[PDB]
Amino acid sequence: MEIKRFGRIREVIPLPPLTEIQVESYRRALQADVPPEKRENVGIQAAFRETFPIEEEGLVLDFLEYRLGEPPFPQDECREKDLTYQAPLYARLQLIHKDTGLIKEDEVFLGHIPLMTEDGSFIINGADRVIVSQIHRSPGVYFTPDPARPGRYIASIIPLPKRGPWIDLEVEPNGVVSMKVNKRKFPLVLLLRVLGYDQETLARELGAYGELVQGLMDESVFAMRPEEALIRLFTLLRPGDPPKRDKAVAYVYGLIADPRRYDLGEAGRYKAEEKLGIRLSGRTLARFEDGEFKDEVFLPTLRYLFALTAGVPGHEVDDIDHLGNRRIRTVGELMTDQFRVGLARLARGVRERMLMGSEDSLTPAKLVNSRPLEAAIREFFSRSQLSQFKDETNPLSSLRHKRRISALGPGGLTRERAGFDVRDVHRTHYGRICPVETPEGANIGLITSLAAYARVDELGFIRTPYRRVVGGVVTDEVVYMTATEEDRYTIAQANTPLEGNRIAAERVVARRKGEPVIVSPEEVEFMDVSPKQVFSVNTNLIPFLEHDDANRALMGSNMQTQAVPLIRAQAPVVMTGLEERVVRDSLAALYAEEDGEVAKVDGNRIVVRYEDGRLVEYPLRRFYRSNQGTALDQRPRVVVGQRVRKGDLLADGPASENGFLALGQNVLVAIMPFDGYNFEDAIVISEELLKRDFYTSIHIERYEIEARDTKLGPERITRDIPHLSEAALRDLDEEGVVRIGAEVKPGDILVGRTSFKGESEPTPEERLLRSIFGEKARDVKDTSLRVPPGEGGIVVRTVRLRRGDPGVELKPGVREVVRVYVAQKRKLQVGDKLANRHGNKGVVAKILPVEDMPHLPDGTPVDVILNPLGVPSRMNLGQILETHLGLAGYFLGQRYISPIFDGAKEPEIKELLAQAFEVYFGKRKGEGFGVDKREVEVLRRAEKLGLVTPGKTPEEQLKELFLQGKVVLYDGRTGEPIEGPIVVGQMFIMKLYHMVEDKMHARSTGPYSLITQQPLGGKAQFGGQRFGEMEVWALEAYGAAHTLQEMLTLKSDDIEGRNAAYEAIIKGEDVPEPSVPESFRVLVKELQALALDVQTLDEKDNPVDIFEGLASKR
Amino acid sequence: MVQVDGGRFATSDLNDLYRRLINRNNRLKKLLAQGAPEIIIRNEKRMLQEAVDALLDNGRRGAPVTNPGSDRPLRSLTDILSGKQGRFRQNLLGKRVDYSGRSVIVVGPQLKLHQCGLPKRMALELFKPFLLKKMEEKGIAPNVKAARRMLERQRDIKDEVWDALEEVIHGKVVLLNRAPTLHRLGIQAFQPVLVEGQSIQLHPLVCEAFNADFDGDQMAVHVPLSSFAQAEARIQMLSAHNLLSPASGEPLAKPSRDIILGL
């Protein structure tokens, strides 16, 4: 099965490491490998150097270095014991007694830093998690136009999130420039004076614009001394506190000059210097030195504001949605921020401890309490919005999850308070953020994906690569550059024709500040590397993307993530070229480190002899359960003695075929309506797919039970469960757990557990029953774990964790925990959801036998039947072209790599179809078979439709139809042909994670809520269906008064009503008349708790007791 | 203040609000009994007023009261009774109901306009009490308890249980529901047909009324119980009886994509 490659664009650079946005950021944050003396002032090192030294002010706690130890347990052990994969963190600290001048140094254990795995994820409490990068407004100085009043501008100084207040500078109508801080407006004249500024300085610097400086020449406070001006400003900012010089200077320094409380950030400082054309010494709005305040940014900001208002050519407003003004906080920056918060809390504790205690007899270990730091870190890695449960349905799912960018989270936007502007595709998203990939619904535009070639720089700004173009020749020099730098050049398109390296086309399509233009080759300065950089990894996996509407390409790219691994998964016939790279960078497959020879091949391990001679044994992840229950196993792809080169594949990962991403099956698809079973996106499949185990997946479910301590006695996990026959306990072993390999159905016992019954005398009927049968009531009851309805399979694993086991940190009162892994092999069935890369999705509605499906004249039945009517409205023509190319490849026995926007065009597909028809009809001619009578009828009908040229022989007309992608298709039920030629081809279809097996649910009676006594919700809790307001409205509109009353009372919360209804039904009677709901009683009692006398009355206004006399005081 | 299966205790925020109110009231009583100065008594009275406010309506005046160790505001009586998550809109105007199921829908072209394809297991669970009664009537089980025990385990269900279930549902109808229920024909009564599988079979002609395609839509099934409810569903809510749109009077169950194409 050879691979034919299409396309003319030569990519100069390969795709960057797809997980580098996680891995490099966390490596920079930790700096665990660089020696401490060579560590740069970034990450947790920056946090240490910022919070320390800690001075009570003669005790000084200075930080010297830190180190990270080896993790206590490996990743597999952390997953198996529900632990966190983390490394111990120690800090080397010295305590200096300024009075005595003595230093005491020791290494203090500051706690545990969670570690990132090689693939880019974390193991938190035994669960795989991904820290989604957050996009937000970059700090710095911005100049926006005032919407209420035209012609005016407002200056915003934005620090890092939760690192200082925003500073607003606005030219008021009166002419006085006003500074807004913490919702309070005050005259910027006062603070400007506090910064040691006189009238002459302002007149000299900002006086070259007009009346704007005259609005900044209020002499009522200029002659006022800086100290009293500072106190007056302190009174403005916080009125009521007694005006004191020390308190006031401390407050102002903390507000605008404290690096530990105000932080503009490296990105913020860089943006401020770039915009205002200045050089900040630090990252604060002002510096406090020599007992006085020196300005850093207020004067340049006000100068820029005045010049912008005046109308100087060189100053312009700032687009806050411009992606050069929007930056990315990756996992490293978020973890560093939370580490700094925890370190500040620890510093507070250290300050309060050194205030007390014996200053002489104090050690750094005693002062430092590491609990706040660990608490902050665990809170960040567990309960943060950006710390998300890892999506690992397939390797592409995890790869996408690691490259997602969320505008939400702590410090970001809100799902509901986000307007259209924040959700739109800005012109600067080109090459940096995928335009089409986004979750449709409430999170559209709020969550996006990093572009394939995009990378986040040191400061957090997404850069994209461009090829340098000089003198008309396109060079191999690639420059990674940001949007603000991108706006300064004319950038050609990657599809521009080139005669070698010289631009051949006289008219070049280019972009200037995001606008499309037509320029000459000499006016081009940069070129796009490839069409792939505009789209994310998921979207780059959709062949013929240029023929798909964006709304459907979104669906296709999103659904590629939801595809489940298949036991016979195979790579698509039509590929884009990223499948191998996706598999390689997902770290799901296994590759050879260097050249060598394979020594041992087994289903569990691969032992390789490398050239240097070292034996390397790679264990194979076998039947591992992902977060979503799918089975993740590695299958060896080498044999003993096989020579392997560096990077050669050793074992396929989940959803991969020979190193190519295989999210589904390549099936024979006929595009035609079929008896209404294709109606409204429904899909018809053949039984042959099930016969040869296509679309068959392996899913593992985990069931957990705990034996605990109770006041009445300990719960025992035992096989001796009271009042059960041998049939129920047949598959349980002597320890009370189900044996490995047993087949379990709903209601079967997984782990047998007995619990001591609450001391309670039985009802007299039960007592009489026991006396009649002479059976003494036992002291324990069945609380064993059973298979829930609709579940089951084969018990493949049993894990038993007992208290005191090494590394097993069970909760108090829990003697032991037992986990049962049950694996089931799911075949494709009616209700299962299939999809393709072009956004065409639908549930299987019918499974036909092989003799019922339409078949080719050679006797080959089709596998899937798709409704053509889903094509015109969705405008995703890429599936049709994929089908044509798949038909060509199916008859030619080859696969195709057609890159998006540069790949197989219609003439090439038609020449391939000509070759395919040549082989497909030459086989028939050699076998001694002419043209079918029914083929002749179809050809006559087709020439009546103008699909074939009149006057040609039947072979030539059949060739024409084949070149159009259509073949003469026969009906398996009647044997007669379909009256028109049908588009039959080979298409790649994915089986999605959404299966009717996990979604079917039913309930008669079950658990009820504690307060309202209404049924619970959710299939997991065996809950009822929510009959919300709109359903009640529908019943009211229908006039179904009694059905509505039943649903409100008899079936939801009328305790007497529901009990009587169930009893009447099981007795063969009609359900009784319902009564008042318990929810109304709860409402009345709550209203009474609000001291409101709610009384239900009758026709004669007399009170009616709805509580049955149970709340009336005698 | 309930004890969960794990032995941990779960309590509502009203207990915390009541505890704060009681603590402040008792401390004010003690301070008054001790002849505390006017400043202390005034502060304690102000705290008592603020605690009463927080109990009645938390967050209305001043900073919301939060449980120490977290920044989540405590849920007061006003929050309990107000909002989309309040008592009215969550438990009074709408409720969760018994005898209700849900499953993915597929197209049934062989169905009649008044019929739907109900999976056997969903029907068994939804019609459990009727099925137990029918099993007791026949020789399948001696009584209702034995029948329920038989139905507890999947492998203990004999083949006559399905015959009894087929006998039970005869004539009865179920309400199929697709969310959002924009109009009244978003809930329609259908005569269930027991089918092998796990997905609900929907007649094509009602899809436009339900705004349901087959790319993964799910529907809820509700079982009316009494004679009034069954009569209302069969007479008023039946799909074959609601053929015209109440909004405009034009047909709403009419030929659709493939039907129109063929005709």
């Binding site: 009125p239 009521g240 506190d241 007694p242 | 400043i39 005034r42 502060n43 102000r46 705290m47 603020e50 005046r61 001043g62």
Partner: peptide, 16 residues
């Protein structure tokens, strides 16, 4: 001082 802040009001009252 601040009517809405109980702590500030108490501190102001005790500062007299």
């Amino acid at each position: 001082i601040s009517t809405s802040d109980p702590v500030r009001q108490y501190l102001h009252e005790i500062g007299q």
